[PDB]
Design a protein around this ligand. Structure first.
Ligand SMILES: [Mg+2]
Ligand SMILES: [Mg+2]
Ligand SMILES: [Mg+2]
Ligand SMILES: [Mg+2]
Ligand SMILES: [Mg+2]
Ligand SMILES: [Mg+2]
Ligand SMILES: [Mg+2]
Ligand SMILES: [Mg+2]
Ligand SMILES: [Mg+2]
Ligand SMILES: [Mg+2]
Ligand SMILES: [Mg+2]
Ligand SMILES: [Mg+2]
Ligand SMILES: [Mg+2]
Ligand SMILES: [Mg+2]
Ligand SMILES: [Mg+2]
Ligand SMILES: [Mg+2]
Ligand SMILES: [Mg+2]
Ligand SMILES: [Mg+2]
Ligand SMILES: [Mg+2]
Ligand SMILES: [Mg+2]
Ligand SMILES: [Mg+2]
Ligand SMILES: [Mg+2]
Ligand SMILES: [Mg+2]
Ligand SMILES: [Mg+2]
Ligand SMILES: [Mg+2]
Ligand SMILES: [Mg+2]
Ligand SMILES: [Mg+2]
Ligand SMILES: [Mg+2]
Ligand SMILES: [Mg+2]
Ligand SMILES: [Mg+2]
Ligand SMILES: [Mg+2]
Ligand SMILES: [Mg+2]
Ligand SMILES: [Mg+2]
Ligand SMILES: [Mg+2]
Ligand SMILES: [Mg+2]
Ligand SMILES: [Mg+2]
Ligand SMILES: [Mg+2]
Ligand SMILES: [Mg+2]
Ligand SMILES: [Mg+2]
Ligand SMILES: [Mg+2]
Ligand SMILES: [Mg+2]
Ligand SMILES: [Mg+2]
Ligand SMILES: [Mg+2]
Ligand SMILES: [Mg+2]
Ligand SMILES: [Mg+2]
Ligand SMILES: [Mg+2]
Ligand SMILES: [Mg+2]
Ligand SMILES: [Mg+2]
Ligand SMILES: [Mg+2]
Ligand SMILES: [Mg+2]
Ligand SMILES: [Mg+2]
Ligand SMILES: [Mg+2]
Ligand SMILES: [Mg+2]
Ligand SMILES: [Mg+2]
Ligand SMILES: [Mg+2]
Ligand SMILES: [Mg+2]
Ligand SMILES: [Mg+2]
Ligand SMILES: [Mg+2]
Ligand SMILES: [Mg+2]
Ligand SMILES: [Mg+2]
Ligand SMILES: [Mg+2]
Ligand SMILES: [Mg+2]
Ligand SMILES: [Mg+2]
Ligand SMILES: [Mg+2]
Ligand SMILES: [Mg+2]
Ligand SMILES: [Mg+2]
Ligand SMILES: [Mg+2]
Ligand SMILES: [Mg+2]
Ligand SMILES: [Mg+2]
Ligand SMILES: [Mg+2]
Ligand SMILES: [Mg+2]
Ligand SMILES: [Mg+2]
Ligand SMILES: [Mg+2]
Ligand SMILES: [Mg+2]
Ligand SMILES: [Mg+2]
Ligand SMILES: [Mg+2]
Ligand SMILES: [Mg+2]
Ligand SMILES: [Mg+2]
Ligand SMILES: [Mg+2]
Ligand SMILES: [Mg+2]
Ligand SMILES: [Mg+2]
Ligand SMILES: [Mg+2]
Ligand SMILES: [Mg+2]
Ligand SMILES: [Mg+2]
Ligand SMILES: [Mg+2]
Ligand SMILES: [Mg+2]
Ligand SMILES: [Mg+2]
Ligand SMILES: [Mg+2]
Ligand SMILES: [Mg+2]
Ligand SMILES: [Mg+2]
Ligand SMILES: [Mg+2]
Ligand SMILES: [Mg+2]
Ligand SMILES: [Mg+2]
Ligand SMILES: [Mg+2]
Ligand SMILES: [Mg+2]
Ligand SMILES: [Mg+2]
Ligand SMILES: [Mg+2]
Ligand SMILES: [Mg+2]
Ligand SMILES: [Mg+2]
Ligand SMILES: [Mg+2]
Ligand SMILES: [Mg+2]
Ligand SMILES: [Mg+2]
Ligand SMILES: [Mg+2]
Ligand SMILES: [Mg+2]
Ligand SMILES: [Mg+2]
Ligand SMILES: [Mg+2]
Ligand SMILES: [Mg+2]
Ligand SMILES: [Mg+2]
Ligand SMILES: [Mg+2]
Ligand SMILES: [Mg+2]
Ligand SMILES: [Mg+2]
Ligand SMILES: [Mg+2]
Ligand SMILES: [Mg+2]
Ligand SMILES: [Mg+2]
Ligand SMILES: [Mg+2]
Ligand SMILES: [Mg+2]
Ligand SMILES: [Mg+2]
Ligand SMILES: [Mg+2]
Ligand SMILES: [Mg+2]
Ligand SMILES: [Mg+2]
Ligand SMILES: [Mg+2]
Ligand SMILES: [Mg+2]
Ligand SMILES: [Mg+2]
Ligand SMILES: [Mg+2]
Ligand SMILES: [Mg+2]
Ligand SMILES: [Mg+2]
Ligand SMILES: [Mg+2]
Ligand SMILES: [Mg+2]
Ligand SMILES: [Mg+2]
Ligand SMILES: [Mg+2]
Ligand SMILES: [Mg+2]
Ligand SMILES: [Mg+2]
Ligand SMILES: [Mg+2]
Ligand SMILES: [Mg+2]
Ligand SMILES: [Mg+2]
Ligand SMILES: [Mg+2]
Ligand SMILES: [Mg+2]
Ligand SMILES: [Mg+2]
Ligand SMILES: [Mg+2]
Ligand SMILES: [Mg+2]
Ligand SMILES: [Mg+2]
Ligand SMILES: [Mg+2]
Ligand SMILES: [Mg+2]
Ligand SMILES: [Mg+2]
Ligand SMILES: [Mg+2]
Ligand SMILES: [Mg+2]
Ligand SMILES: [Mg+2]
Ligand SMILES: [Mg+2]
Ligand SMILES: [Mg+2]
Ligand SMILES: [Mg+2]
Ligand SMILES: [Mg+2]
Ligand SMILES: [Mg+2]
Ligand SMILES: [Mg+2]
Ligand SMILES: [Mg+2]
Ligand SMILES: [Mg+2]
Ligand SMILES: [Mg+2]
Ligand SMILES: [Mg+2]
Ligand SMILES: [Mg+2]
Ligand SMILES: [Mg+2]
Ligand SMILES: [Mg+2]
Ligand SMILES: [Mg+2]
Ligand SMILES: [Mg+2]
Ligand SMILES: [Mg+2]
Ligand SMILES: [Mg+2]
Ligand SMILES: [Mg+2]
Ligand SMILES: [Mg+2]
Ligand SMILES: [Mg+2]
Ligand SMILES: [Mg+2]
Ligand SMILES: [Mg+2]
Ligand SMILES: [Mg+2]
Ligand SMILES: [Mg+2]
Ligand SMILES: [Mg+2]
Ligand SMILES: [Mg+2]
Ligand SMILES: [Mg+2]
Ligand SMILES: [Mg+2]
Ligand SMILES: [Mg+2]
Ligand SMILES: [Mg+2]
Ligand SMILES: [Mg+2]
Ligand SMILES: [Mg+2]
Ligand SMILES: [Mg+2]
Ligand SMILES: [Mg+2]
Ligand SMILES: [Mg+2]
Ligand SMILES: [Mg+2]
Ligand SMILES: [Mg+2]
Ligand SMILES: [Mg+2]
Ligand SMILES: [Mg+2]
Ligand SMILES: [Mg+2]
Ligand SMILES: [Mg+2]
Ligand SMILES: [Mg+2]
Ligand SMILES: [Mg+2]
Ligand SMILES: [Mg+2]
Ligand SMILES: [Mg+2]
Ligand SMILES: [Mg+2]
Ligand SMILES: [Mg+2]
Ligand SMILES: [Mg+2]
Ligand SMILES: [Mg+2]
Ligand SMILES: [Mg+2]
Ligand SMILES: [Mg+2]
Ligand SMILES: [Mg+2]
Ligand SMILES: [Mg+2]
Ligand SMILES: [Mg+2]
Ligand SMILES: [Mg+2]
Ligand SMILES: [Mg+2]
Ligand SMILES: [Mg+2]
Ligand SMILES: [Mg+2]
Ligand SMILES: [Mg+2]
Ligand SMILES: [Mg+2]
Ligand SMILES: [Mg+2]
Ligand SMILES: [Mg+2]
Ligand SMILES: [Mg+2]
Ligand SMILES: [Mg+2]
Ligand SMILES: [Mg+2]
Ligand SMILES: [Mg+2]
Ligand SMILES: [Mg+2]
Ligand SMILES: [Mg+2]
Ligand SMILES: [Mg+2]
Ligand SMILES: [Mg+2]
Ligand SMILES: [Mg+2]
Ligand SMILES: [Mg+2]
Ligand SMILES: [Mg+2]
Ligand SMILES: [Mg+2]
Ligand SMILES: [Mg+2]
Ligand SMILES: [Mg+2]
Ligand SMILES: [Mg+2]
Ligand SMILES: [Mg+2]
Ligand SMILES: [Mg+2]
Ligand SMILES: [Mg+2]
Ligand SMILES: [Mg+2]
Ligand SMILES: [Mg+2]
Ligand SMILES: [Mg+2]
Ligand SMILES: [Mg+2]
Ligand SMILES: [Mg+2]
Ligand SMILES: [Mg+2]
Lengths: 275, 48
RNA sequence: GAGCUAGCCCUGGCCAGGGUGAAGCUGGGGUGAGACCCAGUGGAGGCCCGAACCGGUGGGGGAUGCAAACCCCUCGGAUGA
RNA sequence: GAAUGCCGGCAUGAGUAACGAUAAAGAGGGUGAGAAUCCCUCUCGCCGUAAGCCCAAGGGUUCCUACGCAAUGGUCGUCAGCGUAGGGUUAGGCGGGACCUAAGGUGAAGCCGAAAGGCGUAGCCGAAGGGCAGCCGGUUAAUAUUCCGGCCCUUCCCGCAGGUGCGAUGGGGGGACGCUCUAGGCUAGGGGGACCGGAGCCAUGGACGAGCCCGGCCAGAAGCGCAGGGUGGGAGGUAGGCAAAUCCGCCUCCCAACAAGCUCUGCGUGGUGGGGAAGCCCGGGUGACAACCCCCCGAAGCCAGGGAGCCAAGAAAAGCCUCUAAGCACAACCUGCGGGAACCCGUACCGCAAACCGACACAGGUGGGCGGGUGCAAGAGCACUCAGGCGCGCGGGAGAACCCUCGCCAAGGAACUCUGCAAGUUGGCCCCGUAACUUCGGGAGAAGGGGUGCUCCCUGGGGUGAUGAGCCCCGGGGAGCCGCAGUGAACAGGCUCUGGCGACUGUUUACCAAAAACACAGCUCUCUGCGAACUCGUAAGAGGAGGUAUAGGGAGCGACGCUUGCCCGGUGCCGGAAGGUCAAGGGGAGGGGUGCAAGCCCCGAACCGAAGCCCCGGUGAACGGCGGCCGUAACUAUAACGGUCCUAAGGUAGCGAAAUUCCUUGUCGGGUAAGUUCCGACCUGCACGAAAAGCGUAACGACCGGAGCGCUGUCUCGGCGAGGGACCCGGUGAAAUUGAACUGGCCGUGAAGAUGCGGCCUACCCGUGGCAGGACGAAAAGACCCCGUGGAGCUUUACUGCAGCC
RNA sequence: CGAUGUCGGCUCGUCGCAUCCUGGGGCUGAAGAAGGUCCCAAGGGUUGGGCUGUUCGCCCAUUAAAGCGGCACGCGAGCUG
RNA sequence: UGGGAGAGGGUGGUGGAAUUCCCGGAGUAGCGGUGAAAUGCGCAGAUACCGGGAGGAACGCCGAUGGCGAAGGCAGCCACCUGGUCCACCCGUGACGCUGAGGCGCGAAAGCGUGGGGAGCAAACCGGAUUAGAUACCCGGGUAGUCCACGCCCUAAACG
RNA sequence: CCGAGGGUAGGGCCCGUGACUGGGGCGAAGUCGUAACAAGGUAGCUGUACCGGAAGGUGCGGCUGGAU
RNA sequence: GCGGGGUGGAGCAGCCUGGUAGCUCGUCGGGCUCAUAACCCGAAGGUCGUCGGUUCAAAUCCGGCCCCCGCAACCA
């Protein structure tokens, strides 16, 4: 449950911070961090390819175990639940009875000291990682693989979920967090439950600077630029778009679809997204 | 006020140095150029 | 050609002194339990005054200058984007 | 002979401006041919969070000594960062290398690209980050953690002794980390002493004093003491750490448990080695056998990898420790001890500056450390001062205008002016006191007001120490004295009422615009299912992201509050497996050429044939658009209401002479003696209006309006004073400009504004200080404007291509 | 057009007279006072404020009066902006 | 103390009918709607029918004139937790009571804030009709809302 | 010392008045519709919401003070 | 300056493309009603702004004058 401040500065008015309650270990597992190369949006040519990126807090990257089928049948205890700044979710530390330590995405309702397990024979409880084709129809799930053994790719952001609508051959039918209806291979792994930290969407950054700490540099409207800069540049005084609303590079931004036509994924998208 | 020339031995020899000229086709041609002309120094002197 | 400048990356460094007094915590009151109230404690903040530092608002001077942007007075920020 | 021609030389302005911070000078003695300028002394002034000192970069001999003075030095010059010559920089321990990684760079494997080349895991390179062993003094003209003296320490090689399953580029541990706040104990540094040492002093009225002046330390191995850091011990099992592993991780068990122990640092002491003032007498010597003690203040530095809180969640790798594998255990490693070995480069000097970046010995710029004392509430603020460094490389006079900086001004008090522009006022502290409004934080230092020095008396709490004295830190009460005046100097808000715009702190046109512009949290639309979209690239590859719809791209709007109406006919976009059109290709009714002929070859209808477009729907926080005429109420006026034409639909709420209103200083009200501005209304809104958002809004603003109080040289209206120039004399000595000049007024004339023509009037020759009307004065081959079938940036339903996408 | 800086204010004036005032006049539907109208006259004078960039104008309060024009809409190598 | 009846309340779970959409089938010239129509939908294959899937909301018969609660109000079914109440016995305390300005709490619908959810319904709005007009009643659509959670609002022909 | 009062600054309350603006009351024969009383020709009233020249309309829930 | 308009009483067609004036309302007479509105059945009313030309013929085509809307009026 997010946390408010009294308005003792103009920014403290609306600024809200996470409650951090479910966090039980305030420092990462040194055997599982590694240097996160900050890119600032530059690519290997040294060119800004993603504008307005840079200057945020330094981070170490907690390694996440998006496979989990490395250790079929090896249960593990929940050591702690920590802070990961590289993602919107919380991470949970796993002390495998194997003696191995790994991080996973912390689901909602996961409790320190509980034990979870991965594999075809796993129980259907919050935290267990099973192949999609074995989870009862209708149950929520997260950390879903798109293709078998290729890694968990779907529903990993705080609060997201995915419900198994039904099965069809070697494929089960998922409702993604987007509302899209997709066939995913049954052998693909997923984790029972929804990612925790649901309250992540109600955080009110509160002031410019907070955006800057997140690595997010100020954004300039094409309307504020000049014709050499952006389709919306120029004009004496303010100005409506005066043309179909577009991006700096020409293409239109209000409705223009961009998914690739002949993409082979189309054969498994059952219903495009919603709301 | 800060003027444009702020000398720096390391910057000078890494930017304009012999080995900088030699690793690039443009740079080699610079040295070829300056040899052809008879330049005493093919390269800006910097005290290392 | 990025030894000026603009942005970013890596790694270091710097910010006198004073002021205000958020959450929390303690104690008390309150109540079925609470909410909450008070005092103490606490020391938060793109908080306040003000040097360094970063600036460049107003005026004057300068104008073959001390200077191809300077000087004086005044003024803005000064734990933060 | 002219090209604002090119080169060079020499003029003109002119003995003119200037000679570079207004920190400031004077005399005496020396030296030398020559002295305001060099040396010495005494006096004066200036900096002192520097204008002193030590590093780094940059500079590259500028360092020291001798001898020089042509040039350099804005004057001089005997001097010098100048010329000549000689000398000067010494390290296992300081810095860098023979160590380690960071971004980045390079790059066996690999990938890509017409060539050149671009990528790329490892590895390598890469530092002001990690890691690693020297501290105090003396010494030279010039080097010193480098030479020397003292007391310490490191690595490598080898030997000896003891110990041990030894052994690594391989596994594990460690290294290893933010921000703010901060405990204890220290140290750096400082204040004081009636105590210790000291040459000396008694002045001019007094003082022979518990007087004055000056000093009262630094380094140090082991050990010891103090304060901290780090750290469980043992056993059993084990499938994890890509082989093994007794290590590590996991599990069970026992003991230990704020401890202690072991270990590592800091500080203190510590054998011992140094230092040692004023004053005097020539850098020295004496002082002196110097003394080297007590007390208080005390870090931001040390213990340190300390603690707490917070969210934005805070490098890597080696050294190091441990585990084992090959192997090897005649080895090897560990510990102690000894001897031997220990290379390369830097070291001078300036270093907020005359030696660096600015063409200059240039009022500019330049990162780190030290930065003493007293008082002012604190402090790196301010004033004055220590150490130390300086008086700014032209001077002497004079005492006009005028200019700059500064001081005061009778009466008035903004009447000045576009504007209180500027300059006043206010000004720190402590106390009393403080409004509308509000988002309850704020508005607030609101506003306004009192106090503030010194002396004596009584007294409360605190740190130290001991619970006491002493020192030190906070106070409280009483009685008094002095002046015009007690933050007596310096530094240090003027305030209020009321609009516009923007929520706010932020950002911007380096060098005429800081703002109402950009940004901004927040709101909405939209794209994107992950080999994501999007971006950059021919590509490979990268960013996005080691992220996954609570995410990422794009767009508008811009805290918050209350809200955001109608129009989908046109354009964009989304949907639409019918139809229509539709290229290459398919197909081949039927034509043509040629050949004796089989043949070879050419054209070619129907029909099948994608996207796009057509067509059918949707869609506004998509591009956008949101009427006209005529009539009508029992005074008049006006129209709730009605008639009709047109549209895709006819502007809703809210606002309105507005950052928008043309007519316009609209009309009415307020404010004023008077108000083209202001505020408040009205509504015929030339030409508001709802996310190019509409109406509000506390707080905020070096933004832009209006008004009042305070107070002023802004003004009536000017006067006087200060210093730096201007002026005079000695030194040095420019500049733009310049057809030549023997260069007057008027009224005419003239290419229409004449020193230069005509007529007339005036006028002896040449300077100096001043003023700026003319020389269509100087500067700049007009930016305005036109012209050129000149150029460039930008646009689009101009043309034609191309990338890209379909 | 190988540059003649452009409104207004300020400062400093100077000129014209088609005279705002003061002086001298005729005519008057001039009783007086005070006006009207025209002639002569350029010696001197010709205020301070509110509003606006303003010139102009309107307004306040006075005046003998609150004149009109020229001088590159006089005067930016004099200032302002 | 032993008993009973009940949609009293809160939480979690869950059943079937129906509506809408989507998919498949089969099938064709209309469907829909009204007072009568038109808008609308349908040869780009609707309506009607069978099978499949998705989702939301309300719970038919039981249901009654019934029951429960202080009121507002509560209706599929299951389990947990919790209030009230009536009856019996005649067991304990011994007037410990009634009321209640204030205070505090609950409080239908609509409405507000932040998230979610969205089948049917439907203010607003659009269209078709009617009409002199029709900013209505009727018809085709249709956004909030209706639904969940949390926090507000505190109203009523909150009535017997 | 106190002290009538005078003065300076800032508050609170009341009253009078004000361009314009809000609805209200009343006013013999104004304009527009017909909302309610009959089932008033869509039962009405109601709280709330939104909307419209106006009465009103509509949604959501409620009351009978509704008819047959 | 450039564009559009002017026609029964009101608002609109006809103009282009000559021969013809048409739609809604209103107005007049009749009907239904106790009466009015609405509704129903009939009717009248326009020499086309004005003048001048072209034509056999002009609302129409071309000039002039009149009125009435709309747009423009910029560079210093
Ligand atoms: Mg808050
Ligand atoms: Mg949490
Ligand atoms: Mg690591
Ligand atoms: Mg990267
Ligand atoms: Mg790269
Ligand atoms: Mg590159
Ligand atoms: Mg490049
Ligand atoms: Mg981008
Ligand atoms: Mg970027
Ligand atoms: Mg996290
Ligand atoms: Mg993320
Ligand atoms: Mg699959
Ligand atoms: Mg949010
Ligand atoms: Mg960040
Ligand atoms: Mg922006
Ligand atoms: Mg722009
Ligand atoms: Mg712009
Ligand atoms: Mg560009
Ligand atoms: Mg463009
Ligand atoms: Mg535009
Ligand atoms: Mg623009
Ligand atoms: Mg613009
Ligand atoms: Mg505009
Ligand atoms: Mg727009
Ligand atoms: Mg436009
Ligand atoms: Mg476009
Ligand atoms: Mg989808
Ligand atoms: Mg610069
Ligand atoms: Mg530099
Ligand atoms: Mg260098
Ligand atoms: Mg360097
Ligand atoms: Mg460099
Ligand atoms: Mg390079
Ligand atoms: Mg080089
Ligand atoms: Mg080559
Ligand atoms: Mg040579
Ligand atoms: Mg070169
Ligand atoms: Mg640079
Ligand atoms: Mg500070
Ligand atoms: Mg205070
Ligand atoms: Mg606490
Ligand atoms: Mg000033
Ligand atoms: Mg100053
Ligand atoms: Mg400040
Ligand atoms: Mg010639
Ligand atoms: Mg010349
Ligand atoms: Mg030439
Ligand atoms: Mg030349
Ligand atoms: Mg020559
Ligand atoms: Mg020459
Ligand atoms: Mg010469
Ligand atoms: Mg000459
Ligand atoms: Mg001369
Ligand atoms: Mg001269
Ligand atoms: Mg000069
Ligand atoms: Mg000079
Ligand atoms: Mg100075
Ligand atoms: Mg000074
Ligand atoms: Mg001599
Ligand atoms: Mg001399
Ligand atoms: Mg001399
Ligand atoms: Mg002298
Ligand atoms: Mg000397
Ligand atoms: Mg040099
Ligand atoms: Mg010389
Ligand atoms: Mg010589
Ligand atoms: Mg010289
Ligand atoms: Mg010089
Ligand atoms: Mg000389
Ligand atoms: Mg040594
Ligand atoms: Mg070697
Ligand atoms: Mg070697
Ligand atoms: Mg190529
Ligand atoms: Mg390198
Ligand atoms: Mg290296
Ligand atoms: Mg290093
Ligand atoms: Mg580090
Ligand atoms: Mg070292
Ligand atoms: Mg040492
Ligand atoms: Mg020494
Ligand atoms: Mg010597
Ligand atoms: Mg780490
Ligand atoms: Mg913080
Ligand atoms: Mg020490
Ligand atoms: Mg002291
Ligand atoms: Mg010692
Ligand atoms: Mg094992
Ligand atoms: Mg240490
Ligand atoms: Mg001595
Ligand atoms: Mg001796
Ligand atoms: Mg510090
Ligand atoms: Mg530390
Ligand atoms: Mg500790
Ligand atoms: Mg690395
Ligand atoms: Mg052997
Ligand atoms: Mg051992
Ligand atoms: Mg040295
Ligand atoms: Mg400086
Ligand atoms: Mg420095
Ligand atoms: Mg120097
Ligand atoms: Mg220069
Ligand atoms: Mg230069
Ligand atoms: Mg000098
Ligand atoms: Mg001292
Ligand atoms: Mg002070
Ligand atoms: Mg001087
Ligand atoms: Mg100076
Ligand atoms: Mg003189
Ligand atoms: Mg001065
Ligand atoms: Mg004075
Ligand atoms: Mg005086
Ligand atoms: Mg005065
Ligand atoms: Mg006054
Ligand atoms: Mg006054
Ligand atoms: Mg002061
Ligand atoms: Mg004061
Ligand atoms: Mg007030
Ligand atoms: Mg206000
Ligand atoms: Mg308040
Ligand atoms: Mg303050
Ligand atoms: Mg005050
Ligand atoms: Mg105060
Ligand atoms: Mg007092
Ligand atoms: Mg005194
Ligand atoms: Mg102040
Ligand atoms: Mg702002
Ligand atoms: Mg702005
Ligand atoms: Mg706002
Ligand atoms: Mg804003
Ligand atoms: Mg700030
Ligand atoms: Mg600028
Ligand atoms: Mg510029
Ligand atoms: Mg510039
Ligand atoms: Mg420039
Ligand atoms: Mg400026
Ligand atoms: Mg600007
Ligand atoms: Mg500013
Ligand atoms: Mg903006
Ligand atoms: Mg803003
Ligand atoms: Mg918002
Ligand atoms: Mg949205
Ligand atoms: Mg990545
Ligand atoms: Mg409000
Ligand atoms: Mg449309
Ligand atoms: Mg459409
Ligand atoms: Mg459309
Ligand atoms: Mg097609
Ligand atoms: Mg348009
Ligand atoms: Mg349009
Ligand atoms: Mg509305
Ligand atoms: Mg106006
Ligand atoms: Mg108006
Ligand atoms: Mg006005
Ligand atoms: Mg307005
Ligand atoms: Mg307007
Ligand atoms: Mg105007
Ligand atoms: Mg007026
Ligand atoms: Mg007027
Ligand atoms: Mg008035
Ligand atoms: Mg009006
Ligand atoms: Mg405000
Ligand atoms: Mg501001
Ligand atoms: Mg500002
Ligand atoms: Mg005033
Ligand atoms: Mg004056
Ligand atoms: Mg003077
Ligand atoms: Mg002088
Ligand atoms: Mg003389
Ligand atoms: Mg001379
Ligand atoms: Mg000379
Ligand atoms: Mg001549
Ligand atoms: Mg001559
Ligand atoms: Mg002459
Ligand atoms: Mg003459
Ligand atoms: Mg003439
Ligand atoms: Mg003449
Ligand atoms: Mg002549
Ligand atoms: Mg002549
Ligand atoms: Mg003549
Ligand atoms: Mg004359
Ligand atoms: Mg002169
Ligand atoms: Mg002149
Ligand atoms: Mg002239
Ligand atoms: Mg000329
Ligand atoms: Mg020029
Ligand atoms: Mg030019
Ligand atoms: Mg030229
Ligand atoms: Mg030219
Ligand atoms: Mg020209
Ligand atoms: Mg131009
Ligand atoms: Mg022209
Ligand atoms: Mg042409
Ligand atoms: Mg031509
Ligand atoms: Mg051209
Ligand atoms: Mg191309
Ligand atoms: Mg695309
Ligand atoms: Mg010209
Ligand atoms: Mg010229
Ligand atoms: Mg000029
Ligand atoms: Mg004046
Ligand atoms: Mg007369
Ligand atoms: Mg006169
Ligand atoms: Mg004028
Ligand atoms: Mg005017
Ligand atoms: Mg006039
Ligand atoms: Mg008179
Ligand atoms: Mg002129
Ligand atoms: Mg004129
Ligand atoms: Mg000027
Ligand atoms: Mg002027
Ligand atoms: Mg001139
Ligand atoms: Mg001139
Ligand atoms: Mg002048
Ligand atoms: Mg059809
Ligand atoms: Mg068909
Ligand atoms: Mg659904
Ligand atoms: Mg029933
Ligand atoms: Mg009994
Ligand atoms: Mg309709
Ligand atoms: Mg009808
Ligand atoms: Mg009717
Ligand atoms: Mg309620
Ligand atoms: Mg009195
Ligand atoms: Mg009537
Ligand atoms: Mg009725
Ligand atoms: Mg009724
Ligand atoms: Mg009716
Ligand atoms: Mg309605
Ligand atoms: Mg026509
Ligand atoms: Mg015709
Ligand atoms: Mg019609
Ligand atoms: Mg006819
Ligand atoms: Mg133009």
């Amino acid at each position: 449950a997010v946390k408010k401040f009294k308005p003792y500065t103009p920014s403290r008015r609306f600024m809200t911070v996470a409650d951090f309650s479910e966090i039980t270990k305030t420092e990462p597992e040194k055997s599982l961090v590694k240097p996160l190369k900050k890119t600032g949006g530059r690519n290997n040519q040294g060119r800004i390819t993603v504008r307005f990126r840079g200057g945020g807090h330094k981070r170490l990257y907690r390694i996440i175990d998006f496979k989990r089928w490395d250790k079929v049948g090896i249960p593990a205890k929940v050591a702690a639940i920590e802070y990961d700044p590289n993602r919107s979710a919380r991470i949970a530390l796993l002390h495998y009875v194997d003696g191995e330590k790994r991080y996973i995405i912390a689901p909602d309702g996961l409790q320190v000291g509980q034990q979870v397990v991965a594999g075809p024979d796993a129980p259907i409880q919050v935290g267990n990682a099973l192949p999609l084709r074995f989870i009862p129809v209708g149950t929520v799930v997260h950390a879903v693989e798109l293709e078998p053994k290729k890694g968990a790719k779907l529903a990993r952001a705080a609060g997201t979920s995915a419900q198994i609508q039904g099965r069809e051959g070697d494929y089960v039918i998922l409702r993604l967090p987007s509302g899209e209806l997709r066939k995913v291979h049954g052998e693909c792994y997923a984790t029972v439950g929804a990612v925790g930290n649901a309250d992540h969407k109600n955080i009110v950054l509160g002031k410019a600077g907070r955006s800057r700490w997140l690595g997010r540099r100020p954004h300039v409207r094409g309307a504020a630029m000049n014709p050499v800069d952006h389709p919306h540049g120029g004009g004496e005084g303010r100005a409506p778009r005066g043309r179909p609303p577009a991006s700096p590079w020409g293409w239109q931004t209000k409705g223009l679809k961009t998914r690739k036509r002949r993409k082979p994924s189309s054969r498994f998208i059952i219903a495009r997204r919603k709301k | 006020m800060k003027r444009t020339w702020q000398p720096n031995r390391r910057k000078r020899a890494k930017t304009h140095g012999f080995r900088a000229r030699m690793r690039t086709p443009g740079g080699r041609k610079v040295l070829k150029r300056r040899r052809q002309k008879g330049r005493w120094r093919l390269t800006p002197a910097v005290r290392k």
